[PDB]
Design an enzyme around this catalytic site. Sequence first.
Site, PDB file in Angstrom:
ATOM      1  CD  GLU B  62       5.816 -14.644 -18.628  1.00 41.57           C
ATOM      2  OE1 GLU B  62       6.387 -15.737 -19.299  1.00 41.57           O
ATOM      3  OE2 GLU B  62       6.149 -14.165 -17.460  1.00 41.57           O
ATOM      4  CE1 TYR B 215       8.817  -9.742  -4.707  1.00 37.77           C
ATOM      5  CE2 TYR B 215       8.650 -11.505  -6.096  1.00 37.77           C
ATOM      6  CZ  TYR B 215       9.169 -10.542  -5.708  1.00 37.77           C
ATOM      7  OH  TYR B 215      10.350 -10.060  -6.507  1.00 37.77           O
ATOM      8  CD  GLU B 245     -10.695  17.261  -3.125  1.00 43.88           C
ATOM      9  OE1 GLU B 245     -10.655  16.178  -2.071  1.00 43.88           O
ATOM     10  OE2 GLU B 245     -10.950  18.451  -2.987  1.00 43.88           O
TER      11      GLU B 245
HETATM   12  N1  LIG Z   1       5.825  -6.069  -4.719  1.00 41.69           N
HETATM   13  C1  LIG Z   1       5.843  -6.785  -5.618  1.00 41.69           C
HETATM   14  N2  LIG Z   1       6.763  -6.715  -6.480  1.00 41.69           N
HETATM   15  C2  LIG Z   1       6.744  -7.770  -7.549  1.00 41.69           C
HETATM   16  C3  LIG Z   1       5.740  -8.988  -7.583  1.00 41.69           C
HETATM   17  N3  LIG Z   1       6.185  -9.635  -8.604  1.00 41.69           N
HETATM   18  C4  LIG Z   1       7.251  -9.058  -9.198  1.00 41.69           C
HETATM   19  N4  LIG Z   1       7.740  -7.805  -8.525  1.00 41.69           N
HETATM   20  C5  LIG Z   1       8.732  -6.992  -8.990  1.00 41.69           C
HETATM   21  O1  LIG Z   1       8.705  -6.503 -10.102  1.00 41.69           O
HETATM   22  C6  LIG Z   1       9.953  -6.511 -10.809  1.00 41.69           C
HETATM   23  C7  LIG Z   1      10.227  -7.683 -11.894  1.00 41.69           C
HETATM   24  O2  LIG Z   1       9.283  -7.105 -12.926  1.00 41.69           O
HETATM   25  P1  LIG Z   1       8.211  -8.259 -13.524  1.00 41.69           P
HETATM   26  O3  LIG Z   1       6.742  -7.453 -13.220  1.00 41.69           O
HETATM   27  O4  LIG Z   1       8.225  -9.234 -12.956  1.00 41.69           O
HETATM   28  O5  LIG Z   1       8.472  -8.265 -15.291  1.00 41.69           O
HETATM   29  P2  LIG Z   1       7.384  -8.113 -16.283  1.00 41.69           P
HETATM   30  O6  LIG Z   1       6.528  -6.872 -16.312  1.00 41.69           O
HETATM   31  O7  LIG Z   1       6.566  -9.389 -16.256  1.00 41.69           O
HETATM   32  O8  LIG Z   1       8.239  -7.759 -17.527  1.00 41.69           O
HETATM   33  P3  LIG Z   1       8.836  -9.142 -18.397  1.00 41.69           P
HETATM   34  O9  LIG Z   1       8.679 -10.583 -17.659  1.00 41.69           O
HETATM   35  O10 LIG Z   1      10.218  -8.655 -18.578  1.00 41.69           O
HETATM   36  O11 LIG Z   1       7.832  -8.992 -19.826  1.00 41.69           O
HETATM   37  C8  LIG Z   1      11.059  -6.918  -9.575  1.00 41.69           C
HETATM   38  O12 LIG Z   1      11.607  -5.649  -8.939  1.00 41.69           O
HETATM   39  C9  LIG Z   1       9.925  -7.557  -8.856  1.00 41.69           C
HETATM   40  O13 LIG Z   1      10.735  -7.828  -7.224  1.00 41.69           O
HETATM   41  C10 LIG Z   1       4.743  -8.963  -6.649  1.00 41.69           C
HETATM   42  O14 LIG Z   1       3.938  -9.868  -6.406  1.00 41.69           O
HETATM   43  N5  LIG Z   1       4.696  -7.954  -5.557  1.00 41.69           N
HETATM   44  N1  LIG Z   2     -17.606  23.304   9.894  1.00 41.07           N
HETATM   45  C1  LIG Z   2     -17.313  22.443   9.069  1.00 41.07           C
HETATM   46  N2  LIG Z   2     -16.523  22.304   8.117  1.00 41.07           N
HETATM   47  C2  LIG Z   2     -16.226  21.355   7.118  1.00 41.07           C
HETATM   48  C3  LIG Z   2     -17.326  20.197   7.039  1.00 41.07           C
HETATM   49  N3  LIG Z   2     -16.988  19.767   6.082  1.00 41.07           N
HETATM   50  C4  LIG Z   2     -15.696  20.166   5.450  1.00 41.07           C
HETATM   51  N4  LIG Z   2     -15.421  21.365   6.160  1.00 41.07           N
HETATM   52  C5  LIG Z   2     -14.077  22.213   5.731  1.00 41.07           C
HETATM   53  O1  LIG Z   2     -14.375  22.602   4.360  1.00 41.07           O
HETATM   54  C6  LIG Z   2     -12.993  22.493   3.853  1.00 41.07           C
HETATM   55  C7  LIG Z   2     -13.034  21.634   2.681  1.00 41.07           C
HETATM   56  O2  LIG Z   2     -13.947  22.202   1.723  1.00 41.07           O
HETATM   57  P1  LIG Z   2     -15.233  21.263   1.028  1.00 41.07           P
HETATM   58  O3  LIG Z   2     -16.203  22.190   1.146  1.00 41.07           O
HETATM   59  O4  LIG Z   2     -15.030  19.902   1.441  1.00 41.07           O
HETATM   60  O5  LIG Z   2     -14.667  21.263  -0.486  1.00 41.07           O
HETATM   61  P2  LIG Z   2     -15.420  21.587  -1.749  1.00 41.07           P
HETATM   62  O6  LIG Z   2     -16.740  20.376  -1.477  1.00 41.07           O
HETATM   63  O7  LIG Z   2     -14.770  21.337  -2.989  1.00 41.07           O
HETATM   64  O8  LIG Z   2     -16.269  22.854  -1.705  1.00 41.07           O
HETATM   65  C8  LIG Z   2     -12.159  22.145   4.945  1.00 41.07           C
HETATM   66  O9  LIG Z   2     -11.330  23.288   5.536  1.00 41.07           O
HETATM   67  C9  LIG Z   2     -12.992  21.319   6.063  1.00 41.07           C
HETATM   68  O10 LIG Z   2     -12.638  21.468   7.330  1.00 41.07           O
HETATM   69  C10 LIG Z   2     -18.453  20.264   8.197  1.00 41.07           C
HETATM   70  O11 LIG Z   2     -19.224  19.385   8.087  1.00 41.07           O
HETATM   71  N5  LIG Z   2     -18.459  21.090   9.058  1.00 41.07           N
HETATM   72 MG   LIG Z   3       7.106 -11.025 -16.849  1.00 34.19          MG
END
Ligand SMILES: Nc1nc2c(ncn2[C@@H]2O[C@H](COP(=O)(O)OP(=O)(O)OP(=O)(O)O)[C@@H](O)[C@H]2O)c(=O)[nH]1
Ligand SMILES: Nc1nc2c(ncn2[C@@H]2O[C@H](COP(=O)(O)OP(=O)(O)O)[C@@H](O)[C@H]2O)c(=O)[nH]1
Ligand SMILES: [Mg+2]
Lengths: 131, 432, 432, 429, 429
Positions: B62, B215, B245
Amino acid sequence: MAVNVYSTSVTSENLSRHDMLAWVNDSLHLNYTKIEQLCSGAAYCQFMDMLFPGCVHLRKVKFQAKLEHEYIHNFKVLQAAFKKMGVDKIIPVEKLVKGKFQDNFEFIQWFKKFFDANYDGKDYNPLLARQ
Amino acid sequence: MRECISIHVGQAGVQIGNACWELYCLEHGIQPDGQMPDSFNTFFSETGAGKHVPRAVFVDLEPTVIDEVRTGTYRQLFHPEQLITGKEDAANNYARGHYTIGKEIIDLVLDRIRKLADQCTGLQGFLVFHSFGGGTGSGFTSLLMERLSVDYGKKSKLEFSIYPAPQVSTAVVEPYNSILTTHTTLEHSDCAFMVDNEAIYDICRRNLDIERPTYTNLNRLISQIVSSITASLRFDGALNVDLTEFQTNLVPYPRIHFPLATYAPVISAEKAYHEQLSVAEITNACFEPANQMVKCDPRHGKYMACCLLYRGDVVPKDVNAAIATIKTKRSIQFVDWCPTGFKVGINYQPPTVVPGGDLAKVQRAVCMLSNTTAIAEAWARLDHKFDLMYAKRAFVHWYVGEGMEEGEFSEAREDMAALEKDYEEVGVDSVE
Amino acid sequence: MRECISIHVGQAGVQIGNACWELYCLEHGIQPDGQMPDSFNTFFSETGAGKHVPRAVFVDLEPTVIDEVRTGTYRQLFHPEQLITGKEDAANNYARGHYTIGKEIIDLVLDRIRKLADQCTGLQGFLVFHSFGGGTGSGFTSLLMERLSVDYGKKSKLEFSIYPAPQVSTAVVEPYNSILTTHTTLEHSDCAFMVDNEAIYDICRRNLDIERPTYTNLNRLISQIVSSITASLRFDGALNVDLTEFQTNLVPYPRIHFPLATYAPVISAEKAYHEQLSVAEITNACFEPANQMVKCDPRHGKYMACCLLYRGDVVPKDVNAAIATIKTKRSIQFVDWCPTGFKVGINYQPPTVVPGGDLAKVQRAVCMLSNTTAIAEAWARLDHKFDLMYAKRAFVHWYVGEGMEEGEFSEAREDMAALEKDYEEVGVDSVE
Amino acid sequence: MREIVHIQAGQCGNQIGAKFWEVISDEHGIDPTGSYHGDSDLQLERINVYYNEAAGNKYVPRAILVDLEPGTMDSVRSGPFGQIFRPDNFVFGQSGAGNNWAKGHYTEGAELVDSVLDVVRKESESCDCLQGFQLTHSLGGGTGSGMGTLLISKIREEYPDRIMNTFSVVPSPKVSDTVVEPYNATLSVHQLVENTDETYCIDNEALYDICFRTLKLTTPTYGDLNHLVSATMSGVTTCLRFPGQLNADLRKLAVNMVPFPRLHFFMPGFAPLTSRGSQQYRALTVPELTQQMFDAKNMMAACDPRHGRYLTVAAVFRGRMSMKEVDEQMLNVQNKNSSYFVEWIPNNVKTAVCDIPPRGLKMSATFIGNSTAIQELFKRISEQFTAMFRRKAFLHWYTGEGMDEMEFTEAESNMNDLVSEYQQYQDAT
Amino acid sequence: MREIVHIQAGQCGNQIGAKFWEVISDEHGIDPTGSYHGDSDLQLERINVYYNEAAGNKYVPRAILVDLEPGTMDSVRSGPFGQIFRPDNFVFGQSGAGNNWAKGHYTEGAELVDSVLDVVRKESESCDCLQGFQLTHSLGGGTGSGMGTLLISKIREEYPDRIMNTFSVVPSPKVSDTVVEPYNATLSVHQLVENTDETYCIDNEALYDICFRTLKLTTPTYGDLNHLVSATMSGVTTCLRFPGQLNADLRKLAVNMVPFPRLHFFMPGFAPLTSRGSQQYRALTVPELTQQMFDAKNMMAACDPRHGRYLTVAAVFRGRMSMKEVDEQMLNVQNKNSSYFVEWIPNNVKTAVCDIPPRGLKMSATFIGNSTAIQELFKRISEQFTAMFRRKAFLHWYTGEGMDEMEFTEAESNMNDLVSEYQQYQDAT
Ligand SMILES: Nc1nc2c(ncn2[C@@H]2O[C@H](COP(=O)(O)OP(=O)(O)OP(=O)(O)O)[C@@H](O)[C@H]2O)c(=O)[nH]1
Ligand SMILES: Nc1nc2c(ncn2[C@@H]2O[C@H](COP(=O)(O)OP(=O)(O)O)[C@@H](O)[C@H]2O)c(=O)[nH]1
Ligand SMILES: [Mg+2]
Ligand SMILES: Nc1nc2c(ncn2[C@@H]2O[C@H](COP(=O)(O)OP(=O)(O)OP(=O)(O)O)[C@@H](O)[C@H]2O)c(=O)[nH]1
Ligand SMILES: Nc1nc2c(ncn2[C@@H]2O[C@H](COP(=O)(O)OP(=O)(O)O)[C@@H](O)[C@H]2O)c(=O)[nH]1
Ligand SMILES: [Mg+2]
């Protein structure tokens, strides 16, 4: 008639690199040692022929492609076959043809699922298709 | 480089989005017109002129809620094509959202997404804001997730969802919508961060001394959590965590992908003074059940993963110390198959405060993302609610009238039964 | 030196001509009186005094439309002898245009053309503007083309034609006029650029946010395309294309000489900001079927040639990159006998904008001229339309009354049948 | 001669590396621009060990920086000393590894590895006589662990006759910094045992303790931790870069410290470490230094040397000091603490002395201990691995990348075998 | 002595030519007016190789500009250096060729050719000892390709004992810049094989890559591409114009590089190429230069030398450098990369050194490779030709100008034969 498949978050339904390569080699009588060799597109084109009789103009496919443009050409043929069958998955051609492992592995996992959905068990000697 | 694209679905999703984008602008010094007098680039694309546009899509079935965006303070911030509206809403009906009404605009939404993604050099993935209860939030979102999975797949998709309360509802058909959408979205989402209106309201009243929270207040609070999650990408930090991750660290089994978010400290100016607010202090606060943003009891569950995201004036040694003591504590039990339960992020940038906000400015904050078997309680409750209504086929005719089949109700129900049993199984300790 | 002479036939041709010459004047800084306070010379001849006159002929069989030119803002721009009018129009009758009424003024028109050509030192050829549906646009234009072929021959002749829509007509006898004129003109024209009113209207509404587009708007859009085609001759550029090249690059077989024009970007001030508009972005836009100016589906056809004419702040490497990615794309299939399908032009001059125009000022634009087997659909449709009416001999008496013979209807029809089969044959891939 | 190639993988690897390069530049009198502004000819004599000399009197680190995401790299570039590095020596991906060893080793890392190898080969070809490689990284992440190990594998294959050494930041006992850390560590270790010649185990728990208890730093930063590690690192190559009385190098240290090929996991230590107030009340003498070195509280690995036995211990001294005194001190520790030293390797203390002390100091010491107590660390990891693997927790994240259970199993077994080996020699008479 | 006549045909030919003339003028200290404002006597010593000396202390390029349309010519005239050229040396038509080889070779070009020949003959008669001709053009268009080849044919007939060399911009693999490019290229090549003594193949795809990857130019312009080509061009005649230690010239290079008459298609390369930021971190030494030269990414033809073998490679160095070092480097590449060099031509590397470096540089290098890998390019063209010719697509554009299918057929056959010849020597032992 064809169907579409999706793989993202699953468990106990994905083949190891070794197993997958083995399947491809046995199915198509191939000798690949790297999954990335499938990026040439010839194998995929052949699989299409085996799945869906007719479908692809295999006389146009280059089975001993060595150059990026040759690979592109095979994927055009594959793309056309996907269009003909109504399979709606977009093939990321630019990534595949670079021969990158990640993308190729993703594509083979999808294609295996697709194959399984659609394969009827018919015998197929791919050597004749090749030459 | 590490781009992240935000999708805001339905009223909840859009209104939370308004709060989020207002905060982002304040954090990066972007004016409501898109002007600033380099890290912002993960969330804002940049024009030839000195103007910045959110990597966002706002969708509702809508026009009313989006029309406010169009005519409001941030009218110039968004490009017209990123604000997408239909004619008629989904009327609290999943069917209308997923099929009858949703099938008319899904293509448009996806087209815009494609165009957004084209201008990314290193797209990390998607942040999806919606609710479980609405016809759009439930039905449209499920549809969207299906399409995204097909067209992208391996890109990490994250959901922030206004999960319905136990004793505080808005609609009557909420349980139906919740159940169906959970069923349909489950295999397509990588991680979903639940938040509950009741809990936030309670927090506002108790911790912020607000007699009558709106809200808006809840939205603001939500925005803070979002900022904590994305600050590792939007700023420089000591020890970093990037969207991919979280899924690795919080999801032990594919189906069990519902962690919960908790933020600390939430205080007023009167209570911001009179206390020092150390890392240990806020960490302890996070764990304690009263500060949680889901109406659930962790003391009755087991922790499977905790991710702690610290921000501002924080010292890694101190964090380590704080965590160690919490590990000892009797009220925190972890599952037996998980000796290492903490993933820790530390970022240099303090939480920035929105002018006229309910929260006081602090030197440090922390956002915990924790996955607990206690959340299964909520699932059970929801199932019970479904059962009561479905036994009488109450409201079912609506759904069937929009093209849904009754068998699909049963299907969704059984899937949820299975999910409940999965949690229970996980709960138990290992034999031998 | 490289002169180019423009001929505007009937209402469509004249009105598009008004839009084109207004644009040319703005581009070269020529005032409505012919005064300017050197490249313009390809389109304007120059007097002893500081005055410039279009290398153009405007022809219509009735006075009304040309009378507006005579009495309008650009009355002083054109020499009286280049505005040619008869007394009575061709009344939507090809016969009247080609024979009865046309034979009275053809000599005059040709005489003026001869005089124009005499003052050229390097005449490249002719740009002919008309429509398929009108009696003048169809019958007179065909006659004219015959004479031009005889008197000049090897000079490249180009046609811009308001091709009739599928579901949006103006007259009832349109199919007859279209078919006969296509039949008679086919062997005499080198290349004909189709454009469709429906498509342009759709574009105006969707892309330019215009509720109610006027013929003026369509004319303006057309003018842009014309400018892109002729900018290589009217300005300096990096990589150039001159009218003779288009025929070489876009026509694979003599009969298959109907490419289609597409322009990008067409945007408003509201949507010109909020986006960067890169070469890749506009190139992609061009291909996508929604931005096309003929109501036809390329996804259902094959591309035989694409010519891309870029203008303004454009970088050749970038263009190359853009094209490469489009080549990969599944939705773009090219015929098997054409491994090299792109001819590319790049010109330094940005598209200039008419004061009070519907288009926003952009740093870059692109005009694609593409030849596709998909256009055969339109031909089939037109044939079908002819068949339905001809089976009953509906309206045929008019044509016969003006001296046409019924056998010529059949002749034209069979020729078009042949053309349709030619396209189909071309479509198929090579054996072995 | 004896040029060393430095390699940095992942966040931790790169952040340590930056610190190390800041330290070494300071030592050799190199400023953030690459220009020499030092005082003595000794600072330039062996500058080629770590620096390539570029045109116009500049020096550039023989350093290769690798990461699957670009943030850390960017930070380094913007840091103090960021501009000293070769722009072409930053090799960064765009995807990241998501704390997944699989992604680092087989997927994203595999897409990047060749590009790194190309740089590495070029660097190697620069050098007249390549000593080998030093790799800095963690075992707990995805990049440093998975991609780092891949790099180790490939480099070793290419250059099997050069020394391969690693400075590995290991998971601590008290608190984890990653949920899947046991998996990542476990997979890493299997690679390390087969492909490295020596591995310095460094643990943040130990470092924090040192900072808090010994350095009296209420609020240590990661920078301060890094500095300690860098000081150790510099200490290990000091005898290669400066003249001394008894010269060590990387090969000699390996020979002295590694009696069996698989047992190449060390526990490093550094001395002297004192507060600002508390330094005026002590004397920096050799015996004091020795005492500081040989305690448990000053080891940078979370394992108590008193829970095992020392197989071999290398002590490297920097400064002008008495050889006799050093010999006395080393003998003394062996004699009095006889029960903590394996009985079947007599005189299992190796000594080196380099005449050039570190900046600000009259004397300093670096300790390398090969202790059977490090088995505790491995055991912990094995236990943690087991607890998770028995329930197949998180396994779909790795199997999703093409990995099989078999690989995991083998890794687990190998680690267990290493522990058994350590136990065997602990108990041997 | 050894005067060279420069000829430019079509858009590409003329635009390269302008750049080349700007470069050479700068080199010899000639300003846009034709006046010498240089510093050293070496700049004027061999000025007569490229310039005629006119009255009143001016120098005019021995350059002939040809095009069937006047726009490019006009642009050149209006450009910086446009006024240096002889007005009578611009020979332009009014019609154009419409991207049609036929029009360039048989029709429009034929109407213009005699007028050009007349100028050429006059120019030749100026020179005391004419070395020969250098022609710049594309093979993908109509003018440069059809008219250029016609000019080559006629000039060669007139002057069969002079050297005929061409700088040919060839169609790329990834994307075409013309629909009929395979036809135009194919017809051109047939002429080139019979009538030129050497042909430098230059491909825009390679150039863009170089600009993007090596030069770090986000947004290269055609000017920047042209400059690279001009640098190569200047490099090839450097030893004719400046004293050196081991002097090459055009004849010697041909002799060294062309073992069989038809195999005269080279792949040029230039070094050093660096970004503005990235140049301070490297040393401009001979080995570095050599390495830059001998890779695949720095070849200006879209074919990988690793897909074939080098028949003969010529390296031309400019600057004050050590002959011994050069010899070492050249030997090294041959020894270590033995598999990429044909085994039946020992010492297939030819070296030349000219003491005068280019402006701004201490040293520079130009590479000429005669590689069997260039056959790939020809094969591609043949394939593309076939695909079109089998369906007679666009053929009426050429047959309309009097051409017959037979000519096309013969051209196709000749090209195929050339490919076969290359293949034969690739495989020979
Ligand atoms: N946290 C949060 N929840 C919301 C908000 N607006 C609606 N809701 C929640 O969303 C649910 C209602 O779904 P809506 O998103 O209004 O409905 P819709 O997706 O527009 O679907 P239709 O109107 O049936 O086409 C209720 O649980 C509301 O409390 C908001 O601004 N914040
Ligand atoms: N000593 C040290 N350890 C680090 C550092 N940054 C990340 N780690 C360690 O490395 C691990 C995370 O791996 P990382 O190397 O970030 O992931 P990769 O980038 O996917 O290889 C964790 O155990 C961290 O504590 C650093 O600057 N110094
Ligand atoms: Mg709606
Ligand atoms: N794009 C565009 N199309 C026009 C314009 N004016 C007329 N048309 C189209 O031209 C066709 C009608 O032909 P006209 O040019 O009016 O007829 P005519 O050539 O004057 O022929 P007669 O009046 O029959 O002698 C219809 O398809 C109109 O939509 C115009 O200004 N712009
Ligand atoms: N390197 C380079 N290539 C060019 C230039 N101008 C045109 N080309 C190339 O030349 C080809 C077009 O041929 P062109 O010489 O314009 O046609 P002709 O004038 O009919 O010979 C295309 O492949 C262009 O990419 C230039 O300035 N530099
Ligand atoms: Mg009319």
